[PDB]
Amino acid sequence: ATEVTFFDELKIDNKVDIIGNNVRGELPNIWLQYGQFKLKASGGDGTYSWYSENTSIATVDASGKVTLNGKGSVVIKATSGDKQTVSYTIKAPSYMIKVDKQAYYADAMSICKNLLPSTQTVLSDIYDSWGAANKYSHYSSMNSITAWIKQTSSEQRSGVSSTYNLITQYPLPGVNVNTPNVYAVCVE
């Protein structure tokens, strides 16, 4: 006959831990596909288990680390050992960035069905919200991710287009359309 413990009500912290930049704040409105973050649970008996109501949109492991997989809204549930369950909802993003294979500008256009990032900000804003792409499991191997930017009217005339690197923040204008080592990043 030992003594009993008492717990507070289970609560999922609204403050999210973004793996890429060590930021503790709400989930970014704009998404990097396969970006990751740690949901912080509290209360209960300290032991939790996580569940996704839709893997197509997002997945979650045993540590609370959530991986974004698709554009949309999904509910994540945390269950403490003492039989408490709490919901945390993921609001769909304004847009999400996808990284396909490397290609020339023209090909990248068709690949992304003409949904290449409209400006450098579309891409740089994602770095500000998530940080270096390779800090995430899905991109760990890569050291550089150069992405096409939608070429301006003048750029289309000269056969070039500027680029932005999702890891190095490196901007680069006047890149010939038929340049290798450039990823087709679809903005959806």
Numbering used by the authors: 747 to 934
Show me the paper's own sentences about this structure.
Intimin, an out membrane protein expressed by EHEC and EPEC, is required for intimate attachment to the host cell and formation of the A/E lesions. The binding of intimin to Tir mediates the adhesion between the pathogen and its host cell. The intimin of EHEC O157:H7 is of γ-type (designated intimin-γ), whereas that of EPEC is intimin-α. Here, we determined the crystal structures of Tir-binding domain of EHEC O157:H7 intimin at 2.8 Å, together with an Asn to Tyr mutant at amino acid 916 (IntN916Y) at 2.6 Å.
In this study, we solved the structure of EHEC Int188 and its mutant IntN916Y. Crystals of EHEC Int188 and IntN916Y diffract X-rays at 2.8 Å and 2.6 Å, respectively. R-free values were separately refined to 29.6% and 26.8%. These two versions of intimin (Int188 and IntN916Y) were crystallized in space group C2 and P212121, respectively. For the native version, Int188 consists of four molecules in the asymmetric unit while the IntN916Y is present in two molecules per asymmetric unit. Recent study have demonstrated that four important residues (S890, T909, N916 and N927) of EHEC intimin are essential for Tir recognition. It clearly indicates that these four residues locate in the Tir binding pocket which is formed by B, C, D β-sheets and the loop between D, E β-sheets. Int188 and IntN916Y behave completely the same at the level of higher structure (not shown). For the mutant, IntN916Y, the folding mode is completely the same as the native version, which indicates that this amino acid substitution fails to influence the alpha-C backbone in Int188.
